[PDB]
Design a protein around this ligand. Structure first.
Ligand code: CLM
Ligand code: CLM
Ligand code: CLM
Ligand code: CO
Ligand code: CO
Ligand code: CO
Ligand code: CO
Ligand code: CO
Ligand code: CO
Lengths: 213, 213, 213
C-alpha cells in the first residue's frame, strides 16, 4: 500500500496524541507572512505561474514531514508515503468554486503538466467535486487572491480525527522592500505541536528562497 | 413581507449550501486592515463621529449584497430586503456593554438621527438588550476601541443556521503615511465563500474613500 | 481557602455571565503586538532571561484583575486569591513539550528562584505533566519561539465553564525602530468582555515599559 502503520507504542508523542485526540480534542490555526520577494524574481525569469508554483512548494514541504501526512485508517494511525494537493479553483462565470486534486511529483515540470491537464479537463465544471471522491492522501490548499488578510481561521463544528493540514493564502502585498504573502495553517493538535507548524513554515520560506529547478 | 424566499433549486451555490450547512458545517473569520486615511479627512470636515459613521458604512455595504442578508425562516432560505445594524455600546460607569439596534436608512443624515435617538433613550440602560428582542433582520457590529489587534475570532459552541455576519473593529493605528483600521468579519460558509467576504471588504474600502454625501 | 465565592446576584455582569455561559456559549481570541523595545534594554542590563520574565509579567498582570482568575468550584463562581503560571517547555532531544507550573511571587527574584528550581528538577522529564495534576488556580502560557505569527487561535471541541485565560506568544521581530512581540489571548466570554482583555494587554504593555525591580 501507499502508507505505513505508525508505531504509536514507542512514539515520543504517544501521551500527547491520546490527550489531544480524546481528552481535550483541539486544533489550532496560525497566520504568518512568508517573504516571496525572491520567488517573484524566480517566477519573473520563467513561464511558471504563481498559484501552481505555491501549490507545488506547499505540497513539497508537506511531503517532507511525516506528522503532516497522518490519518486514521481502520482505527489505526498511518503515515501516507505521499499526499496530493486538493486546491480550490474559482469560476468567474458563476462566482463559485470547485476543489480539484492532481498527483504530486518532485519534478516541478511533471507537476505543471499534471496541473494543466486537470485544469484543461475541468475548467468549466461547476460541481463542488468534479473528479468525484477526494483521494484519502490529500492536503487542502485554498487561495483568496482578492483581499489581503492578517488572520484566517475555519470554525468547524466537528473535526474529530481529521489530520490533514488546511492551508489558506491571501493576496500578497508590498511591505517596504519586501513582498509578503499571508499564509494560514490549521492543524489538529493530536499530530502537530507548534514546533511542527513552525518547522513547516520555515522550510516553505527556504523553498521560496531557492531555485525552482 | 420584508424578505423574499430564495430560489435554492436553481442557485449556482446549491450544492455548496447543503454541503456547508449539513455535511461539513463550518464558518470562517478573517481580519484585514481598511485604509481610513481619506475617511478621517472627510470626518474632520464634518460634524459626524467615527463609530456611527463606521456603523452606517458597514450596514450600507451589507445592504448591497444578498448573501450577507440570508436567514432560515420556517425551514426555508430567505433574503431580507434590508437589515438593521445591532451594535455594542459601552457603559463607562459599570464597565459593561449593551447591544442596541436602529433602523438603517440610505440617507446618512436620517441614519444619524435614528442613532442619536436610540442612544438618547438608552444611554443609561445596562440591560444586555434594553430594547427587548433583536430584530430578525440584523447584522452584528462591535468595537474594541481600547486596543489594536491583528486578529479576532469568536469560538461559538453552536452556530447552526445562523447566517448574519459578525463584524468587529479594533482601535485604528498610524502605519507610516496611512491610518489603518483592523476589521474582522466572521460568516457561515453555507452562504458565503471567501470571494463574497473579499467583495464586501473591497466595497467597504471604496465607501470609506468616497464622499459621505 | 485561597479563593472567595463571588457575589453573582449583585454583579453588574450577571445577565452577561448567564447569557455567555449557557444561552450562547462562546469565547474569543485576539492577537495584538506588544512593544518590547524597553523590556529588551532592561533585560540587556540584567541577568534575567526573556521567557521567565515574560511568564512573570503575564502572571503579574493576570494577578491584578479578578475577571481573569474566575472558576466554577462546587457549582459556584469563585475568584482565586492568586493564580500560578502553567507554561510549556520544549525538549530539544525528543522535539516534544511538557507543561510545568511554579508558584507566583510578586518578588521577581523569588519568582526566578521558583522557576529555575522547577526547571532544574524536570528539564529531562518528557511526560506531558511531570508534576502530576495541574493546580486548579492556574493560567496557561505557551511560546512558539521558532516563528513569528500575526494570529493564533485554539479550536477546542469543548470549553464548557473553563475560564482560565490562554496566552500564546510568538517569536518577536524588528518593525522599524521597535521590537514587537505577537501575543494571543483567548478567554471565555462568560467572564471577560473585550474591554477586560484590552485592559489586561494595556497593563502588560505598561509593565514591559517599567523597571523590573
Ligand atoms: O471545504 C473544503 N475546503 C476548504 C477550502 O477553503 C478548506 O481548504 C477546508 C478543508 C477541510 C476543512 N475541514 O475539514 O474542516 C475545512 C476547510 C474542501 Cl472539503 Cl471542498
Ligand atoms: O453577543 C453579541 N454580540 C457580539 C458582540 O461582540 C458579537 O457581535 C456576536 C454576535 C453573534 C455571535 N453569535 O451569534 O455567535 C457571537 C458574537 C449580541 Cl448577541 Cl449581544
Ligand atoms: O494543552 C495545554 N496547553 C496549551 C499549550 O499550547 C494551551 O496553553 C491550552 C490550554 C488549555 C486549552 N484549553 O483548555 O482548551 C487549550 C490550550 C496544557 Cl493543558 Cl498541556
Ligand atoms: Co482514548
Ligand atoms: Co518521501
Ligand atoms: Co441536508
Ligand atoms: Co436594496
Ligand atoms: Co443557565
Ligand atoms: Co492580589
Amino acid at each position: 500500500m501507499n502508507y505505513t502503520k505508525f508505531d504509536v507504542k514507542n512514539w515520543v508523542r504517544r501521551e500527547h496524541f491520546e490527550f489531544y485526540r480524546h481528552r481535550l480534542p483541539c486544533g489550532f490555526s496560525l497566520t504568518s507572512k512568508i517573504d516571496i520577494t525572491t520567488l517573484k524574481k524566480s517566477l519573473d525569469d520563467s513561464a511558471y505561474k504563481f498559484y501552481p508554483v505555491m501549490i507545488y512548494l506547499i505540497a513539497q514541504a508537506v511531503n517532507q514531514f511525516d506528522e503532516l501526512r497522518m490519518a486514521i485508517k481502520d482505527d489505526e494511525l498511518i503515515v501516507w508515503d505521499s499526499v496530493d494537493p486538493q486546491f480550490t479553483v474559482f469560476h468567474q462565470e458563476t462566482e463559485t468554486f470547485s476543489a480539484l486534486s492532481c498527483p504530486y511529483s518532485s519534478d516541478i515540470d511533471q507537476f505543471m503538466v499534471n496541473y494543466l491537464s486537470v485544469m484543461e479537463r475541468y475548467k468549466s465544471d461547476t460541481k463542488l467535486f468534479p473528479q468525484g471522491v477526494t483521494p484519502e492522501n490529500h492536503l487542502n490548499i485554498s487561495a483568496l487572491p482578492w483581499v489581503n488578510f492578517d488572520s484566517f481561521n475555519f470554525n468547524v463544528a466537528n473535526f474529530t480525527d481529521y489530520f490533514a493540514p488546511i492551508i489558506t493564502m491571501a493576496k500578497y502585498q508590498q511591505e517596504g522592500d519586501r513582498l509578503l504573502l499571508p499564509l494560514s495553517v490549521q492543524v489538529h493538535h493530536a499530530v502537530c505541536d507548534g514546533f511542527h507548524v513552525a518547522r513547516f513554515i520555515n522550510r516553505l520560506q527556504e523553498l521560496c528562497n531557492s531555485k525552482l529547478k
